[PDB]
Design a protein around this ligand. Structure first.
Ligand code: MG
Ligand code: MG
Ligand code: MG
Lengths: 145, 184, 252, 145, 48, 155, 196
């Protein structure tokens, strides 16, 4: 939307800004213009590290299409509501029902092994593993070690 | 070795009509093959000293090309101007090679430099082409040599010979540059 | 702003003739364009298409429409380069000159793919460098050399004779897949025909002018039968002083 | 202003400015390369001391070398000091002089005297430079200042 | 939270910059990685 | 009493750097030029507006080896040891995968198999494929691609 | 300029106050000395004061390293000469030039091998001088008193164990038969020194 021009992936940008402007020298607005400008160009303006896949986007292009079919140019909220109502009734086989990649809401544990271990602190482990609890068919006479 | 001073008309006349000294030295050495003279080790020494007058300047440049991991992008006008100025200050004796080198590596490049370097380099060693094309470019645009090629050739040659040496691109800090005690 | 404007479109003046609909369509296209630019940036291999020294946004004058030339540049050639890149990586030929790819894949199968692709890439390159948009008049020294060989007792007869012989060689190539060259054997001029997937450098000649006799080249404009007209036009648009300076460098 | 502009006028050469305004232009051997055309000023010379050291070149050979200490100064804010061990008297003089031009220091005279005490030791010599109403010092130290 | 639930479906995960910048094509890459030897340190005023 | 031979001319192993450090010449030349009585050398005309970096300090005054003193001369693997293990192991299982992007010199504007494969390795892992299987699977991917290629070559 | 920064017209350039008072040091060391040989305080090679130094003690064993000319020296062909000696000692009826050929083939190679090793070792002497040697500038590490500080650290320890008292003190040596010749009531084993 061009709300802002500048973007960065650098850890703790704040420190680097500080110590960059410490090495900087004069206060004449030429010097200032260049120093600021160079900082902006090197980090905050996106070149060579960047891709469209990688920026965080809610409105990724199918979503835009849908939005403008829903909310664009509708002169009340009521219009919007019966528009929506009319859209939720479309079958899965209709041309005009378009799919999209949906961002998966992340799980807590992330894997099933984690599920077991997490479950297992609410439980009491057995002293012996399941395959040896049941006595041998032979008889083991217990001696001192 | 008392360097002359510029003076009134005769000295400037003598600067004008000076011509090429590097070729003159060579003629005078060669001329020892004339029937009435001998071949002189002194004439050759004077030849040598005029061929190598710059010499160490080239040497300095080698270090800026090969002795520095990640000296930024050397094509960009900024780092380029750093290099240019320092070179012109190694020539004309305004600075020591040590001081110029320590200047070059400590020159200002770009904010959060290392963290931008993590976006290109693994172990922080850039590629050396930009550096050599730059360091030849400076010597060409500075007027350092009378004949144009010599800059590029010497800088290239001196690198290629060192390529075969054990631990070629590292140097002891004390012997690398001008210091009280030196290498033979 | 040049960087931010996508590859195809032109940057011009607002006449404010835009309805909101197509104004939005444009931004959509631009969005997708950014996407495909991001993927092309990584799909980039070692070799790449040549920058054209002359504007082709309109056709190449007296010769090509926009669509003909652009069907060469941005369809067949760009493909050839894709193949060349795909097969020069994973092999001993990674990251060498166009040459030492042309030259070390010469005359053999099992590198046949690489060689064909490489020599194709060259042929196209040299073809574009061979066309000067409004055409040039062939320079005196080259005119002299050409006279000593082809000229039979007529004024600059060498020019109409060369531009004849080329037509002949082109029509004498039946496949309509390949290249017609004017080259310097090192002892004399002659016009050669190379089949598709062969170049003057593999045969170690020194090329002066290239002509594209691929059917794909003249098919959109001159039709199936229009080759004669095509060549005739090519001489309105060819680049002679190039051929000349290459010739003089070959001699010394 | 930490790094002031200084003198930029290029209408003559450095060597012509130097020639006109400086006595130093007359003695091109006594000056090191980095300073050659650089001074606009006249320098007083003060020979503090002469002395004799024996120099043994071999178990038979013995030479008499002398030892000079002097300091170059110009009341315009620039001085420097040098010493040398040479064969002749003239030699150690010229030597120590180009040594004293190698070591030249400057002082910012905006403040006319130090604004806080400087306590510093040269080798084994403990020195105090402090603010006073006027110049007080041993005669020699006094006109070095 | 009792209900943000409607928001949660068109909600957006946060993008993987760490490994993206890890896997960027680099100009120091090597077929087989070697760790640098150990650099010279300062052993004190007498040793240098 | 016997000493090491050259101790007379032995340099000060802590302080011999000071003399040459860029800041020094910046300050000195700064108050020298300020006089009005010196003609600034041109290096000073330049570094006047690009004064050198602040916090690089030598190893003599700071006694630490681990301190990375230089923004420039620094070398530290960006590769975390896990990554090292992974792409190193990938590359030992096949030399073709390792060599691919860089046979001679590093061709750094082209994507490389080692990276692509690492990418889809992590890809597999987060779909819950285990270590070994993910590795042989990615390797199979590369090999079947290569199979296509060299089939075309033969055809 | 035309030559080094640390050497002027008359000799080494005298920076510290030791050189202004004692300016023999400026130009003299050893027998091997030349005027260009100042500032390089090491002289030529095969020459007096050419020897490179390692932590201050000079390196005089170089040949001994590559196993040319050493008592421990690297030996090329053994199996040969032992085989041939065996033959020579066994009997005189049959004679073997069959072995002597194998053997002198071996030696014939050995020559160029040795020139190779000698060459490489001279390269080592040079590399060493550039990148390792301090040129006799740093204090010896190779004699025990040079490590005195270290030893002190342990004396200190044995003292604090003794209630911070007997420094450099050790247990009195006893007798060969100390334990078994002494009656009850007398110390049969040597005590801590504070425990006298
Ligand atoms: Mg004694
Ligand atoms: Mg002695
Ligand atoms: Mg001796």
């Amino acid at each position: 939307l061009g709300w802002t021009d500048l973007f960065t992936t650098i850890p703790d940008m704040t420190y680097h800004i500080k110590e960059w402007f410490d090495t900087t020298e004069h206060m004449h607005n030429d010097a200032v213009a260049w120093q600021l400008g160079h900082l902006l160009e090197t980090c905050f303006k996106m070149k060579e590290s960047h891709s469209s896949a990688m920026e965080r986007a809610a409105i990724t292009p199918t979503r835009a299409r849908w939005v403008e079919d829903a909310f664009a140019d509708q002169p009340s909220v009521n219009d919007i509501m019966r528009t929506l109502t009319e859209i939720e009734q479309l079958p899965f086989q209709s041309t005009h029902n378009t799919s999209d990649e949906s961002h998966i809401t992340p799980y807590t544990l992330g894997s099933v092994a984690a599920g077991v271990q997490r479950l297992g602190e609410h439980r009491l482990r057995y002293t012996l593993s399941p395959w040896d609890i049941t006595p041998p068919e032979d008889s083991v006479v217990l001696k001192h070690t | 070795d008392i360097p002359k001073n510029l003076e009134g008309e005769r000295s400037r006349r003598d600067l004008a009509s000076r011509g090429d000294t590097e070729f003159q030295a060579l003629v005078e050495f060669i001329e020892g093959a004339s029937y009435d003279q001998l071949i002189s080790g002194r004439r050759f020494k004077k030849v040598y000293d005029v061929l190598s007058e710059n010499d160490d300047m080239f040497i300095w440049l080698c270090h800026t090309a090969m002795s520095v991991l990640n000296p930024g992008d050397m094509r960009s006008r900024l780092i380029y101007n750093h290099l240019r100025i320092l070179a012109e200050s190694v020539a004309s004796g305004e600075m020591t090679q040590r001081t110029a080198f320590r200047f070059f590596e400590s020159a200002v490049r770009s904010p959060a430099y290392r963290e931008i370097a993590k976006r290109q380099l693994e172990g922080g060693a850039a590629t050396r082409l930009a550096g050599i094309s730059a360091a030849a470019d400076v010597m060409r645009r500075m007027g350092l040599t009378r004949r144009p090629m010599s800059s590029y050739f010497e800088l290239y040659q001196r690198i290629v010979e060192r390529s075969e040496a054990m631990t070629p691109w590292g140097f002891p800090p004390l012997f690398q540059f001008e210091e009280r005690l030196s290498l033979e | 702003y040049h960087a931010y404007v996508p590859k195809g479109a032109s940057v011009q003046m607002g006449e404010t003739f835009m309805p909101s609909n197509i104004a939005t369509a444009v931004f959509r296209e631009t969005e997708a364009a950014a996407a495909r630019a991001d993927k092309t940036k990584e799909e980039t291999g070692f070799f790449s298409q040549p920058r054209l020294n002359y504007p082709v946004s309109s056709g190449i004058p007296a010769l090509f429409s926009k669509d003909q030339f652009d069907m060469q540049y941005s369809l067949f050639h760009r493909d050839v380069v894709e193949t060349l890149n795909r097969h020069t990586l994973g092999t001993p030929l990674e990251g060498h000159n166009l040459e030492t790819v042309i030259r070390k894949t010469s005359f053999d199968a099992t590198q046949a793919v690489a060689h064909t692709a490489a020599s194709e890439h060259f042929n196209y390159c040299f073809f574009y460098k061979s066309l000067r948009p409004w055409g040039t008049a062939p320079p005196p020294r080259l005119r002299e050399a050409l006279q000593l060989q082809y000229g039979t007792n007529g004024s600059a007869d060498a020019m109409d004779e060369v531009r004849r012989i080329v037509w002949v060689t082109a029509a004498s190539h039946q496949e309509r897949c390949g290249w017609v060259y004017l080259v310097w054997s090192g002892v004399h001029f002659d016009v050669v025909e190379f089949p598709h997937g062969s170049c003057p450098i593999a045969s170690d000649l020194i090329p002066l002018l290239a002509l594209n006799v691929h059917e794909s080249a003249y098919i959109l404009d001159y039709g199936t039968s229009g080759l004669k007209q095509y060549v005739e036009n090519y001489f309105k648009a060819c680049n002679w002083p190039l051929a000349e300076r290459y010739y003089l460098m070959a001699i010394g | 202003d930490l790094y002031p502009e200084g003198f930029q006028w290029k209408h003559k050469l450095n060597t012509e400015y130097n020639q006109w305004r400086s006595n130093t232009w007359l003695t091109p051997d006594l000056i090191p390369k980095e300073h050659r055309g650089r001074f606009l000023c006249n320098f007083q010379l003060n020979i503090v001391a002469y002395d004799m050291r024996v120099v043994k070149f071999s178990p038979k050979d013995h030479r008499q070398w002398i030892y000079c200490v002097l300091y170059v100064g110009s009341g315009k804010g620039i001085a420097g000091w040098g010493r040398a061990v040479a064969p002749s008297t003239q030699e150690a003089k010229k030597e120590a002089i180009r040594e004293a031009f190698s070591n030249i220091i400057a002082v910012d005279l905006e403040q006319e005297g130090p604004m806080y005490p400087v306590r510093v030791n040269a080798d084994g010599v403990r020195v105090l430079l402090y603010p006073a109403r006027r110049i007080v010092a041993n005669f020699r130290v006094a006109d070095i200042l | 939270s009792i209900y943000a639930h409607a928001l949660s479906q068109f909600a957006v995960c946060r993008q993987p910059w760490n490994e993206y910048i890890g896997l960027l094509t680099k100009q120091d890459s090597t077929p087989y990685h070697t760790e640098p030897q150990e650099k010279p340190a300062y052993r004190g005023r007498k040793q240098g | 009493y016997k000493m090491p031979k050259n101790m007379g001319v032995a340099p000060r192993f802590d302080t011999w750097n000071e003399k040459y450090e860029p800041w020094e010449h910046m300050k000195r030349m700064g108050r020298l030029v300020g006089t009005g009585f010196y003609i600034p050398p041109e290096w000073y005309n330049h570094f006047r507006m690009f004064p050198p970096i602040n916090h690089n300090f030598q190893q003599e005054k700071t006694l630490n080896p681990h301190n990375a003193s230089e923004p420039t001369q620094d070398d530290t693997s960006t590769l975390s040891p896990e990554r090292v293990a992974l792409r190193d192991e990938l590359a030992r299982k096949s030399r073709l995968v390792a060599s691919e992007g860089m046979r001679y010199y590093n061709i750094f504007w082209v994507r490389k198999p080692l990276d692509t494969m690492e990418k889809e390795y992590y890809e597999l892992k987060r779909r819950g494929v285990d270590h070994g299987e993910a590795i042989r699977k990615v390797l199979q991917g590369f090999y079947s691609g290569l199979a296509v290629k060299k089939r075309v070559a033969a055809i | 300029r035309q030559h080094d920064s640390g050497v002027n017209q008359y000799g080494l350039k005298p920076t510290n106050a030791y050189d202004y008072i004692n300016p023999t040091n400026l130009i003299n060391f050893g027998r091997g000395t030349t005027f260009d040989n100042l500032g390089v305080r090491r002289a030529g090679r095969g020459e007096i004061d050419s020897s490179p130094s390692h932590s201050g003690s000079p390196v005089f064993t170089q040949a001994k390293l590559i196993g040319l000319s050493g008592e421990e020296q690297l030996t090329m062909c053994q199996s040969e000469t032992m085989a041939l000696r065996l033959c020579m000692a066994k009997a005189g009826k049959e004679t073997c030039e069959r072995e002597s050929r194998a053997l002198d083939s071996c030696l014939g190679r050995v020559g160029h091998l040795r020139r190779a090793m000698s060459e490489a070792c001279w390269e080592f002497n040079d590399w060493f001088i550039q990148n390792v040697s301090d040129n006799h500038t740093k204090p010896f590490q190779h004699r025990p008193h040079d490590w005195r500080h270290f030893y002190a650290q342990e004396k200190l320890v044995r003292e604090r164990q003794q209630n911070g008292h007997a420094y450099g003190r050790r247990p009195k040596q006893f007798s060969f038969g100390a334990r078994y010749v002494k009656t009850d009531g007398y110390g049969k084993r040597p005590r801590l020194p504070y425990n006298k």
